Amino acid sequence: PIFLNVLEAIEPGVVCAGHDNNQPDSFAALLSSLNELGERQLVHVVKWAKALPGFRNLHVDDQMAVIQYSWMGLMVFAMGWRSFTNVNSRMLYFAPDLVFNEYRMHKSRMYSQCVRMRHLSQEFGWLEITPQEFLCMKALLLFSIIPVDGLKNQKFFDELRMNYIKELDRIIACCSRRFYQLTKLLDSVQPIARELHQFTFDLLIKSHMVSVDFPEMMAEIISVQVPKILSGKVKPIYFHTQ
Numbered sequence: 001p002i003f004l005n006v007l008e009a010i011e012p013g014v015v016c017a018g019h020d021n022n023q024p025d026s027f028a029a030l031l032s033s034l035n036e037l038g039e040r041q042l043v044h045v046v047k048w049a050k051a052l053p054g055f056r057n058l059h060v061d062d063q064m065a066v067i068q069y070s071w072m073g074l075m076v077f078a079m080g081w082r083s084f085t086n087v088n089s090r091m092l093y094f095a096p097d098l099v100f101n102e103y104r105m106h107k108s109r110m111y112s113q114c115v116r117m118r119h120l121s122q123e124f125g126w127l128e129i130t131p132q133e134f135l136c137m138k139a140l141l142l143f144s145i146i147p148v149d150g151l152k153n154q155k156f157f158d159e160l161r162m163n164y165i166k167e168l169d170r171i172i173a174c175c176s177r178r179f180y181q182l183t184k185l186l187d188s189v190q191p192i193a194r195e196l197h198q199f200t201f202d203l204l205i206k207s208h209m210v211s212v213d214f215p216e217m218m219a220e221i222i223s224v225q226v227p228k229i230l231s232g233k234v235k236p237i238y239f240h241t242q
């Protein structure tokens, strides 16, 4: 099973946020470290994506675009999986050095978005998601958000997305209900990503007022690509009609 060999081989390892756990759990300190984590993870997501089967057949401009649109969903989904494996159902394992308890969820001012992420994390348990299913679903998430006006080569994108969907099907077949369940879970990622897109955008705009630092790559993607999602120029592809 070449496809699963590849997905297991390229899966990124542990990334630390570099958070100073010695300081108080302030809004500014927590969100600055989440931003730093995001910047560090993005480096890993790019290297991961470029090594996926068939990814290099996209036009190079579309390679950059799909990563810049899908990162939030991808990172939230991977975070749910590691939370599921590592911490209890009340906590979120963003990184080994940045674990949110209930107090930090409140102080981050993201309590309601955190509730949704905890629920996503728990679904991995409720649905008994295997590591193989997790890997195939995470790969599909990279191909689940695109411009309404289309990518440079929309045709190659649609064929690649089709091949990832068939891969998920094959992994299940080793049923109809299972495919239904997994596609419903994938769709559930998108409304969570949208709330976080909204939150991070609003925060970048007032970042100097509230003393939150945004690293360079994050500030660029949040001011350039995230507003296209929020204005509806780039939209998630749902399996089921929303």
Ligand SMILES: C[C@]12CCC(=O)C[C@@H]1CC[C@@H]1[C@@H]2CC[C@]2(C)[C@@H](O)CC[C@@H]12
Pocket (backbone or CB within 6 Å): 031, 034, 035, 037, 038, 041, 072, 075, 076, 079, 093, 094, 095, 196, 199, 200, 203
């Ligand atoms: C993707 C990250 C960081 C990586 C991860 O584990 C998931 C997590 C989800 C919340 C994001 C965060 C990056 C920084 C963001 C975008 C903040 O600006 C507000 C919400 C944060």
